[PDB]
Scaffold this active site. Structure first.
Site, PDB file in Angstrom:
ATOM      1  N   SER A 118       4.757  27.147  26.960  1.00 42.58           N
ATOM      2  CA  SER A 118       4.495  28.368  27.725  1.00 42.58           C
ATOM      3  C   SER A 118       4.906  28.258  29.198  1.00 42.58           C
ATOM      4  CB  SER A 118       3.006  28.743  27.622  1.00 42.58           C
ATOM      5  OG  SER A 118       2.799  30.098  27.984  1.00 42.58           O
ATOM      6  N   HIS A 119       3.922  28.337  30.092  1.00 44.67           N
ATOM      7  CA  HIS A 119       4.153  28.279  31.541  1.00 44.67           C
ATOM      8  C   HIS A 119       4.283  26.862  32.106  1.00 44.67           C
ATOM      9  CE1 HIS A 119      -0.257  27.538  31.547  1.00 44.67           C
ATOM     10  NE2 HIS A 119       0.089  26.738  32.541  1.00 44.67           N
ATOM     11  N   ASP A 289       6.726  34.565  31.704  1.00 43.56           N
ATOM     12  CA  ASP A 289       6.547  33.121  31.596  1.00 43.56           C
ATOM     13  C   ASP A 289       7.564  32.535  30.631  1.00 43.56           C
ATOM     14  OD1 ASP A 289       3.768  32.575  29.212  1.00 43.56           O
ATOM     15  OD2 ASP A 289       5.465  33.975  29.186  1.00 43.56           O
ATOM     16  N   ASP A 291       7.691  31.319  27.603  1.00 48.76           N
ATOM     17  CA  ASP A 291       7.887  31.783  26.238  1.00 48.76           C
ATOM     18  C   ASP A 291       7.762  33.294  26.084  1.00 48.76           C
ATOM     19  OD1 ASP A 291       4.705  31.252  24.532  1.00 48.76           O
ATOM     20  OD2 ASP A 291       5.106  31.636  26.660  1.00 48.76           O
ATOM     21  N   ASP A 293       5.304  35.658  26.637  1.00 51.87           N
ATOM     22  CA  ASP A 293       4.142  36.451  26.263  1.00 51.87           C
ATOM     23  C   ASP A 293       3.301  36.864  27.467  1.00 51.87           C
ATOM     24  OD1 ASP A 293       3.075  33.935  26.755  1.00 51.87           O
ATOM     25  OD2 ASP A 293       1.610  34.052  25.101  1.00 51.87           O
ATOM     26  N   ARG A 294       3.726  36.540  28.691  1.00 52.24           N
ATOM     27  CA  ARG A 294       3.036  36.985  29.898  1.00 52.24           C
ATOM     28  C   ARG A 294       4.020  37.631  30.873  1.00 52.24           C
ATOM     29  NH1 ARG A 294       0.081  33.680  32.904  1.00 52.24           N
ATOM     30  NH2 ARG A 294       1.348  31.820  32.428  1.00 52.24           N
ATOM     31  N   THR A 358     -12.468  35.180  26.246  1.00 54.45           N
ATOM     32  CA  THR A 358     -11.095  34.743  26.431  1.00 54.45           C
ATOM     33  C   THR A 358     -10.582  34.117  25.141  1.00 54.45           C
ATOM     34  OG1 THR A 358     -11.437  34.397  28.799  1.00 54.45           O
ATOM     35  CG2 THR A 358      -9.624  33.205  27.758  1.00 54.45           C
ATOM     36  N   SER A 379      -5.019  37.273  33.221  1.00 57.87           N
ATOM     37  CA  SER A 379      -4.062  36.177  33.360  1.00 57.87           C
ATOM     38  C   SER A 379      -2.650  36.619  32.983  1.00 57.87           C
ATOM     39  CB  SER A 379      -4.482  35.000  32.473  1.00 57.87           C
ATOM     40  OG  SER A 379      -4.782  35.492  31.186  1.00 57.87           O
ATOM     41  N   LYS A 390       0.796  38.315  22.576  1.00 57.22           N
ATOM     42  CA  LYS A 390       1.106  39.145  23.733  1.00 57.22           C
ATOM     43  C   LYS A 390       2.625  39.183  23.950  1.00 57.22           C
ATOM     44  CE  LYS A 390      -1.300  36.596  26.353  1.00 57.22           C
ATOM     45  NZ  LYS A 390      -1.753  35.632  25.317  1.00 57.22           N
TER      46      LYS A 390
HETATM   47 MG   LIG Z   1       3.082  32.028  27.388  1.00 56.19          MG
END
Ligand SMILES: [Mg+2]
Length: 563
Positions: A118-119, A289, A291, A293-294, A358, A379, A390
């Site tokens: 991810s991030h 981010d 991947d 999803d944000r 969460t 977030s 997401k």
């Molecule tokens: Mg992510």
């Protein structure tokens, strides 16, 4: 073409816990620990019933970080040897996390393995992650990750085809004939973007968006993929198909080290985008981010749409999006620490608002029950039930759809929103690497204070505002789908004026714990809603630090990060 199956003796590792976001370790751990990756991949595949493997497809892809392609090759060699009938793999190994979820659901795959952390940073000295998604396209739930971990800890061998090699760069079907196995192993290399773009083409009105983004009077946009997986999606969807000029695609070439930076969208990690936006040349900016999803949303001059407001604005203009015109709005949800901005829209439009702990599973449960259309997290997370992750680029096209119908600037839309619903001023204070014993003592003392019968009704003043405690608890959630009860999910101080203070404490890592302090200050006064947020939030911040004795318990006089 023809490859042998062999059994490799291995020694188990004891820390291969798959978590809700996948197993994440330093790249060097994967490289320096013999059979670390192989053990974990085998443990994943061992959760699939042998009887169901030949007819199974696994979707495989990742965010482009260093070690990804080596991991994908290992996955192919082990999947083949274990009797998995087919892998569907994005070209060059590239699939965003939303694309994986899309493809799993579209082709009715049994699940997917996503190579992303991810991030978190990537590169030879960075992190690597292995995430398992199941047949609804979403993260493997705890019962499955528990089983993977249990298998992981006692594994003594795995099956592998050492000579099998996939060409990740060429589209189409590659077939592998396995020695002394009747049915072949099939790998389909697919374009990384196609299926996801075809999904978005049905969700959104691409004709309207093309008109918005092309020509002289176009909306001018800057879309920063932060050198991560969403790059090709931006280029092929927003630029090639929807006609945004090529310079709209910022940092849209995936890099194995994400350019040497964290692909994490916020004002400081995406400072380059913010500075670009500060010039006043562009109407809309966004960052994703690693991947995909944000998402962070920006307006002209770098105006920051905070993620809690972003989901509320999308809710308030949701029928600008063709998908929701057709499905209707089944429900709204936010994580409990996310600001109450979404609730104001839900209450006014009389749509159910679910406030969840969460974690994805609470959203996925409600979506699977046909009770959840739009969800948001403070977030930088926004999604819909179009998939079961997401989706950052989806949120951008949602915003673009709203800009096309409203014909107003991002900032004017927010100002109108605040005038209509009042404003939830919102900030999150992160205290990182705090000593966990003191932090835990802080939470336990605060919870005891909140539990006393006199605490409700207590009043806090500062400086021209009086806050009255309406409710104070340690958040609990009874899931209406799977019956699970999640306890100890966050200390909530809920005030009669619609404001809240929330404390959450992370688990303890090797450097300590993180305290998350969320401040949600509700204002309806026209003379207050357009003030500076950290100024308007200062009274409740003062109250939060006083009642928690955070400085006294942790020694911190300031948070590490303010968002
Ligand atoms: Mg992510």
């Amino acid at each position: 073409n023809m490859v042998k199956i062999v059994t490799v003796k291995t020694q188990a590792y004891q820390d291969q816990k798959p978590g809700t976001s996948g197993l994440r370790k330093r790249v060097k751990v994967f490289q320096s620990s013999a059979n670390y990756a192989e053990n974990f991949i085998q443990s994943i595949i061992s959760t699939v019933e042998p009887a169901q493997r030949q007819e199974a497809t696994l979707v495989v892809g990742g965010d482009g970080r260093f070690y990804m392609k080596e991991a994908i090759q290992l996955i192919a060699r082990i999947a083949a040897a274990n009797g998995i009938g087919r892998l569907v793999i994005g070209q060059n190994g590239i699939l965003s996390t939303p694309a994986v979820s899309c493809i799993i659901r579209k082709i009715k795959a049994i699940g997917g393995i996503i190579l992303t952390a991810s991030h978190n940073p990537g590169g030879p000295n960075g992190d690597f992650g292995i995430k398992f998604n199941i047949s609804n396209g979403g993260p493997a739930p705890e019962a499955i990750t528990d089983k993977i971990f249990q298998i992981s800890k006692t594994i003594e061998e795995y099956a592998v085809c050492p000579d099998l090699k996939v060409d990740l760069g060429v589209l189409g079907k590659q077939q592998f004939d396995l020695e002394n196995k009747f049915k072949p192993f099939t790998v389909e290399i697919v374009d990384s973007v196609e299926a996801y773009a075809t999904m978005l083409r049905s969700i959104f009105d691409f004709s309207a968006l093309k008109e918005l983004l092309s020509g002289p009077n176009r909306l001018k946009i800057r879309i920063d993929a932060m050198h991560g997986v969403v790059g090709p999606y931006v280029k092929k969807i927003l630029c090639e198909e929807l006609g945004a000029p090529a310079n709209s695609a910022v940092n849209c070439v995936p890099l194995e080290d994400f350019g040497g930076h964290h692909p994490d969208p916020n004002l400081t990690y995406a400072a380059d985008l913010v500075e670009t936006m500060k010039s006043g040349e562009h109407d809309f900016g966004a960052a994703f981010d690693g991947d995909g999803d944000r998402n962070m949303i920006l307006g002209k001059h770098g105006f920051f749409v905070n993620p809690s407001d972003s989901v509320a604005v999308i809710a308030a203009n949701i029928f600008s999006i063709p998908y929701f015109q057709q499905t209707g709005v089944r429900g709204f949800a936010r994580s409990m620490p996310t600001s109450g901005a979404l609730d104001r829209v839900a209450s006014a439009t009389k749509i159910a608002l679910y406030e969840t702990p969460t974690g994805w599973k609470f959203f996925g449960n409600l979506m699977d029950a046909s009770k959840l259309s739009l969800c948001g997290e403070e977030s930088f997370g926004t999604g819909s039930d179009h998939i079961r992750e997401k989706d950052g680029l989806w949120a951008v096209l949602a915003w673009l759809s709203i800009l096309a119908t409203r014909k107003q600037s991002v900032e004017d839309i927010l100002k109108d929103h605040w005038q209509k619903y009042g404003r939830n001023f919102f900030t999150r204070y992160d205290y990182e690497e705090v000593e966990a014993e003191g932090a835990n003592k802080m939470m336990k003392d605060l919870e005891a204070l909140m539990f006393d019968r006199s605490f409700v009704g207590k009043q806090f003043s500062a400086n021209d505002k009086v806050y009255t405690v309406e409710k104070a608890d340690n958040f609990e959630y009874s899931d209406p789908v799977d019956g699970s009860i999640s306890r100890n999910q966050g200390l909530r101080l809920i005030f009669t004026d619609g404001s809240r203070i929330v404390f959450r404490l992370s688990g303890t890592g090797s450097a300590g714990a993180t305290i998350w302090l969320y401040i949600d200050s509700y204002e309806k006064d026209v003379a207050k809603i357009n003030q500076d947020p950290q100024v308007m939030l200062a009274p409740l911040i003062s109250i939060a630090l006083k009642v928690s004795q955070l400085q006294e318990r942790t020694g911190r006089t300031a948070p590490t990060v303010i968002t």
